[PDB]
Design a protein around this nucleic acid. Structure first.
Lengths: 51, 343, 150, 149, 55, 228, 88, 141
RNA sequence: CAUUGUGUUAUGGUUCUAUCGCAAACCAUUGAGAU
RNA sequence: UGUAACGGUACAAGCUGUAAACAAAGG
RNA sequence: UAGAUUUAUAUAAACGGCAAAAAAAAAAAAAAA
RNA sequence: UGGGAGCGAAGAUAAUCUAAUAUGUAGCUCCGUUCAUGGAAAUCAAAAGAGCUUUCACUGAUUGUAUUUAUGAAACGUGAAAAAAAAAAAA
RNA sequence: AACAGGUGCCAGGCCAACAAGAAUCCGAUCCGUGUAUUCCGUAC
RNA sequence: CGGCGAGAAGGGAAGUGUGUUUCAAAGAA
RNA sequence: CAAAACCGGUGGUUUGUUAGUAUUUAUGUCAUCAACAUGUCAAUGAAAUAUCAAUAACGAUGAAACUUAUGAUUAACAUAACAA
RNA sequence: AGGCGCGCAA
């Protein structure tokens, strides 16, 4: 067991969370298969009114 | 290890934006003077900078330069505490960062109860301590366009340097020509304006650091250099028109120490007006209210009874007799000291 | 080992002149800076029967592996110095706790420093009161239970 | 911790016996070690008693001493004559194991005959060495003469 | 590359550039011409020996 | 647990660039042979240069897709084909160090972003796109974006993109070593030239006495001489 | 190495051997004489038969046994004084 | 010793004028030929007082098996070939050359044996110094 | 000391391995480029 | 990304996509 | 990088409440991952 | 992932058995590994001092916990590796 | 002697586009990158 | 031939004899 | 007391001559799951761009063949030939 | 840096 610290005692749920990419640890210099770079995405409409 | 809570915050150094090709708007778009960010005509709407006025009413200030590494709620509480000095604050809001809702983008809005309170609040910028990245918050009133005076601190530092130079000049003049009348001596003293240091008649540093020449002479340590002697603005002029300034005969070391002391005291005067206390002219607060105020910044230590369970069995005997007796003796000593304080 | 030509053939001829035509292998020892030059390093780079080493890398293994040892005078003196001063570096020799590190003069003994001990030995040498002296010693002295010291 | 056990006796640390050096101009030769293989001498040495110590003084140990290399006493009851040589170049290996028995000849007569035997063996060895050197020189002469052709 | 490429008789070869100083440049040219002259001497001797053997 | 230490040791052995250089010293022998090598699986997919197939070149405008720079747009400054990495202007500002030149105490600069974490931007819609190379009859090449069918603008020129790489200058200075003493670094050309003349005499004089006012004669050096 | 924290507590290593207290020190002693009580509250040495246990229970504390020298050379025996020379 | 030290803030080094003045003093006392002084001058000049700096370079002791080839002509005067040995092979050291390798000792040999290591090192240094020679070309006669 | 055995030789029975491969590290070179 | 189903190809543990092994000589 | 390049691999996540059918009116409705 | 987080066993040792060991291990779910973990003292220590954090060796299988089995990269400290604090009031 | 590949098997000089031997003698039945002797190239 | 002194939180910890020592529960690569 | 680099391109070394090799289905099971089948892509040979001629014999090529060449290889085990 | 040993005689 690692006792918490000033920067580490607060945590979020693994699945119900507010996404904050600025603070989430990431390694941009590596390939991430989870993002499926090979797979093309669909460009959705940027504005919708009444669906 | 796990997903980060609001205790873990990160930010990164911002590269200054340079339009390397001035004509290439696709890759080097113009910055907006309102939002201070790249123009995105495809996916953004023009902002006049007065939108928050329609939300928070005319008595609103926009605050800019708020730091990183702080929760929007913590900053809201701190700004409310600061701006309560000028009146009743209806609301304080701090805009979150685009990439981290737990941190601020650097902008806030303060809505006051009274126009006069908001106008009084807008006059001076807000200097923050090191824990807030030493930032100087800039204030802008949405109903009158009035802005804070972001150069106040450095202009006052220049004024203090000018005052020290004036004292040295006057002492040299007295040492050369001997005692001199006030209305003739004062015209030989000059200051250097801010920030480019152009020579000027010395009348502004005196009134920004002391309020008048009589205040300058009567306030320490300049009364240890000079001695005024009898042979509103009208009273000041008449009173000075019938005086002679005499020097206090000092050595070089004593005079240098006095000049340094004057500089330090004026610096303290400058810091006081920026660190005026937030409880000034306000009612006392109960102990519970003070504890609630403290909790915004610090958490109380966890109970020692819960803490004892952290003593690992590998090296400790949990709930050990000598350790618990030591705790009891410490508690007794603390209670005895508190009783002594009470008596 | 300074050469004015980089050609392998000239160095081969020099080696053959020095060691003959029947030399199995050679170890060439030099200091590195002013004892040998890049021409020599180029010339020897394709003579599979010879191996270049600096003084720091000399071993019983190298000396046994390579039949001949060809050493410059500078490298030989460097090796001799290293060998002769190694015991001092490793601390296998006595020190003298003086600023110069050399031995200090041995003082003279104070006269009569052992006269009482000599007299006590002379008294005890009669040896006829053996049990009495033994009992005196038993009363006076005590064996220690510690493992270090007296 | 490597503690060496020590023994104490009469308030002293007990040590194995140890004697000093007594210079001698000419140490006399030892009594032969072969005597220690006899039952009588073995018992004399193994019994630390007054009778043994008196028999030791009564025994004439000087009669067993041989003043000749290669001649000495054997528990057989005889004088052993030894002479060992190995010559690989000439393929000649000699090991003399001669015995002159007291029962056959007599103590002193057997001793004398053994000494004479050893002396003769030495003389013959010297003469053989000389002859071998001569023959080797002759062989070299023959090989050179053959190579002349 | 000998692991994944074609077979090649010669490895990577570099020929030293001439020195800039004119004196050393002349000496270098002399050395190169000497190499060439030795090769040509070998070739001419071979031809002469072949002709003599033929006759 | 009593295995974490040895596990960390054996895992660092996987990253160690063994053998490392080792300076010989008298009667010392290297431990490099005793150090084991990292273990890897050698049967893997072959190397590829994804920039070639993606038609991404220095000077193109791209968007960072994931990480603390998500949604940021910048011009590509450098492409590493072996690493399949890209340097994007004003993104991944991770490398900070003491300033090697003039200005503030610290300077920070970008670090490579893997090419898969980045995407080309359509000139009309300004969203991630795919770019294909088409060829006209004359052989002129045109890069076309999938989303709008627009031609890609010509990449920004190296002259406009150029910026000094201060981290490499910092590395060079660090390799040189700590700052010199001011007194040692002060130039002394006259005494240095005197010492250089003395050094010439020392190195190439063959042990002849130095010139003096009494006998300033020039001693002729001996040649090596042929054996006869 | 590893030592036995329980075994170590009952013994003391000295220059003359391992030492130990005596069982019956903390027991019923009303019926002992004064001599027996003195011996009971004194100490003694671990018997040679029990030393092999230490080799494995207390590896870091070694007592190097030293018995008397056993030298069978006939020349060092008292009877050598009755001989004119040594045996060799 | 000091000229080899780095020129950083924590080291003590002689300055250029200090070296020149020391050389002048030894010259006045007829010690300008001092081995240590000469080597100090050489090492100081090599680095220009430690101001020109480069990463530590190691002169190779081994080369890779299939290294590249640098082609350069023999930069040697004409008519020059390496010297040839006398005869084919020298007599066997053990079988026939025993007498030539042993000689009766003399007091001069004992004195040479007793000479000190500093003298031996100075002898070697000066020998290399004197024997640093080269072959001349036609235009240098 | 067999034509129901043995000695010797022969023929069968019999294990199956033909590099379709070789940095992500380091060394040395060389363009562009910075100083 | 990787893999596979069918189809074409010497009806195949290879290659390959209905343009299924080849365009390099266009206003 | 001359072109072409079928089908399956349940994908609005280049994205944000969780929760069947990659995301379902409020509530019922429940959770160590 | 013998790295980090959550939950969390038995076969085995204790010559049965309990604690403790196995072990905070296996399985299950979640991070995704030097661009990381962590972190610039309301710290540790003695009445002298050290100076964020991190890695290695020693101190030492010592002082400890378990009290039939075993566990224990303890603390201070010593010798090394690496070295950093904080560009930043606006422009 | 790791002066790599290929050539009928063990080749620095036969091929391999940039160095150097169709070298000589001896080989049960074919060949020899083999034995013995010798020359040459090599900053490979 | 050095003079009454340059804004150091009234809080945490350390034996319970705290006269003393140390720190500030408040900030960046 | 001696001595004093970054991004492309091109090769080489080490990992690794000392270590190992892993991609396709025949066969089992309701399923989880299990599991080195069948020598080698390859007649033999260095070469088939040496298998020609031919009812048969002598011939052809080859170092070796209508065959110890038109698949090789122990023991146990199978069959024969010769011998007193 | 550290580890073991360091006469009981004179």
């Amino acid at each position: 067991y690692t006792p918490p610290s000033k920067r580490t005692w607060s945590k979020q749920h693994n699945k119900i969370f507010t996404p904050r990419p600025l603070s989430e640890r990431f390694s941009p210099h590596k390939l991430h298969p989870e993002f499926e770079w090979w797979r093309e995405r669909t460009v959705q409409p940027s504005a919708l009114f009444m669906g | 290890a796990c997903r980060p809570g609001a205790t873990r915050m990160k930010w990164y150094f911002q590269k200054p934006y340079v339009r390397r090709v001035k004509s290439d708007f696709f890759r080097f778009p113009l910055l907006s003077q309102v939002t201070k960010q790249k123009i995105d005509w495809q996916y953004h709407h023009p902002r006049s900078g007065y939108e928050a006025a329609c939300i928070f009413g005319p008595n609103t200030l926009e605050v800019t330069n708020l730091p990183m590494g702080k929760t929007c709620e913590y900053l809201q509480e701190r700004l409310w505490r600061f701006f309560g000095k000028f009146g009743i604050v209806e609301q304080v809001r701090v805009l979150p960062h685009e990439r981290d809702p737990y941190q601020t983008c650097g902008t806030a809005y303060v809505c006051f109860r009274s126009r006069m309170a908001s106008l009084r609040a807008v006059r001076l910028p807000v200097h923050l301590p090191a824990s807030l990245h030493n930032r100087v918050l800039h204030l802008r009133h949405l109903g009158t366009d009035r802005t804070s005076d972001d150069l106040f601190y450095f202009r006052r530092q220049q004024a203090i340097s000018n005052l020290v130079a004036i004292a040295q000049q006057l002492y040299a003049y007295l040492e050369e020509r001997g005692p001199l009348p006030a209305h003739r001596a004062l015209r030989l003293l000059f200051e250097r304006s801010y920030p480019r240091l152009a020579w000027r008649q010395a009348g502004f540093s005196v009134r920004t650091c002391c309020g008048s020449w009589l205040g300058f002479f009567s306030r320490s340590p300049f009364n240890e250099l000079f001695y005024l002697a009898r042979e509103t603005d009208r009273e000041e002029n008449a009173m000075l028109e019938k005086m002679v300034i005499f020097p206090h005969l000092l050595s070089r070391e004593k005079l240098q120490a006095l000049l340094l002391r004057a500089g330090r005291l004026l610096q303290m005067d400058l810091q006081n007006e920026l660190s005026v206390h937030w409880r000034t002219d306000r009612p006392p607060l109960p102990d519970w209210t003070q504890k609630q105020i403290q909790l915004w910044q610090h958490q109380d230590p966890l109970p020692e009874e819960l803490q004892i369970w952290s003593r690992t069995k590998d090296y400790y005997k949990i709930h050990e007799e000598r350790f618990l007796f030591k705790l009891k003796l410490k508690k007794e000593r603390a209670q005895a000291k508190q009783e002594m304080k009470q008596q | 080992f300074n050469l004015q030509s980089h050609k392998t053939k000239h160095c081969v001829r020099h080696l053959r002149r020095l060691l003959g035509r029947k030399c199995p292998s050679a170890l060439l020892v030099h200091e590195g800076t002013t004892d040998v030059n890049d021409n020599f390093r180029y010339a020897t780079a394709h003579i599979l029967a010879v191996r270049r080493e600096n003084v720091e890398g000399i071993n019983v293994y190298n000396l046994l592996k390579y039949r001949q040892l060809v050493i410059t005078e500078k490298a030989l003196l460097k090796l001799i110095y290293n060998i002769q001063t190694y015991p001092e570096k490793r601390g296998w020799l006595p020190k003298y706790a003086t600023p110069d590190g050399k031995p200090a003069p041995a003082p003279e003994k104070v006269e009569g420093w052992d006269r009482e001990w000599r007299q006590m030995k002379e008294r005890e040498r009669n040896a006829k009161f053996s049990k009495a002296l033994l009992r005196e010693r038993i009363l006076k002295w005590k064996w220690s239970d510690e493992t270090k010291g007296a | 911790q490597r503690v060496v056990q020590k023994r104490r006796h009469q308030m002293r640390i007990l040590h194995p016996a140890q004697t000093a050096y007594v210079p001698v101009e000419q140490r006399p030769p030892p009594i032969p070690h072969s005597l220690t293989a006899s039952s009588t001498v073995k018992r004399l040495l193994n019994n630390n008693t007054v009778a043994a110590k008196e028999a030791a003084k009564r025994i004439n140990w000087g009669a067993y001493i041989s003043h000749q290399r290669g001649v000495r006493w054997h528990p057989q009851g005889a004088w052993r004559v030894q002479f060992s040589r190995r010559n690989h170049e000439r393929n000649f290996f000699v090991r003399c194991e001669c015995y002159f028995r007291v029962g056959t000849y007599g103590f002193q007569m057997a001793k004398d005959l053994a000494i004479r035997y050893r002396q003769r063996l030495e003389k013959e060895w010297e003469e053989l060495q000389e002859q071998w050197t001569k023959l080797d020189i002759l062989e070299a002469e023959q090989r050179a003469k053959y190579k002349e052709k | 590359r000998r692991r994944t490429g074609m077979q090649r008789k010669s490895g990577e070869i570099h020929h030293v550039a001439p020195p800039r100083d004119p004196v050393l440049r002349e000496l270098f040219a002399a050395a190169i011409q000497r190499e060439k002259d030795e090769k040509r001497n070998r070739e001419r001797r071979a031809q002469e020996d072949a002709a003599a053997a033929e006759k | 647990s009593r295995y974490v230490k040895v596990y960390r040791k054996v895992m660092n052995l996987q990253r160690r660039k063994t053998p490392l250089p080792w300076t010989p010293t008298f009667l010392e022998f290297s431990k490099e042979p005793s150090v084991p090598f990292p273990v890897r699986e050698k049967l893997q997919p072959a190397p590829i240069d994804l920039s070639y197939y993606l038609n991404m070149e220095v000077g193109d405008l791209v968007e960072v897709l994931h990480g603390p720079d998500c949604g940021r747009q910048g011009v590509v400054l450098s492409i590493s084909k072996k690493r399949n990495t890209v340097v994007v202007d004003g993104c991944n500002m991770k490398k900070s160090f003491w300033n090697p030149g003039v200005g503030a105490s610290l300077v920070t600069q970008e670090m490579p972003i893997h090419i898969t974490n980045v995407a080309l931007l359509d000139p009309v819609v300004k969203r991630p796109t795919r770019v294909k190379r088409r060829f006209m009859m004359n052989g002129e090449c045109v890069r076309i974006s999938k989303l709008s069918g627009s031609a890609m603008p010509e990449p920004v020129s190296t002259s406009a993109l150029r910026q000094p790489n201060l981290y490499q200058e910092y590395l060079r200075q660090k390799a040189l070593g700590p700052p010199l003493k001011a007194s040692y670094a002060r130039p002394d050309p006259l005494h240095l030239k005197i010492l250089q003349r003395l050094a010439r005499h020392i190195s190439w004089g063959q042990g002849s006495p130095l010139p003096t006012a009494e006998n300033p004669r020039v001693n002729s050096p001996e040649p090596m001489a042929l054996r006869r | 190495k590893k030592n036995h924290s329980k075994v170590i507590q009952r013994f003391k290593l000295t220059r003359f051997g391992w030492q130990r207290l005596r069982s019956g020190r903390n027991g019923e002693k009303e019926n002992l004489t004064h001599k027996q009580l003195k011996r009971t509250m004194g100490y003694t040495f671990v018997s040679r038969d029990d030393l092999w246990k230490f080799r494995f229970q207390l590896p870091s504390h070694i007592l190097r046994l030293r018995d008397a020298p056993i030298n069978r050379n006939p020349n060092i025996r008292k009877i050598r004084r009755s001989l004119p020379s040594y045996f060799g | 010793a000091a000229v080899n030290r780095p020129a950083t803030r924590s080291y003590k080094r002689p300055l250029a004028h200090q070296l020149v003045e020391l050389h002048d003093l030894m010259r006045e006392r007829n010690l300008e030929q001092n081995k240590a002084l000469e080597q100090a001058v050489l090492r100081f000049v090599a680095d220009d007082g430690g101001c020109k700096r480069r990463p530590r370079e190691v002169k190779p002791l081994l080369y890779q098996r299939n290294r590249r080839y640098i082609s350069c002509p023999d930069l040697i005067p004409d008519g020059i070939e390496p010297a040839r040995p006398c005869a084919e092979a020298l007599p066997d050291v053990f079988m026939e050359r025993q007498a030539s390798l042993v000689r009766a000792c003399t007091p001069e040999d004992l004195a040479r044996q007793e000479l000190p290591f500093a003298v031996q090192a100075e002898t070697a240094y000066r020998r290399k110094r004197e024997n640093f020679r080269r072959l001349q070309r036609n235009k240098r006669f």
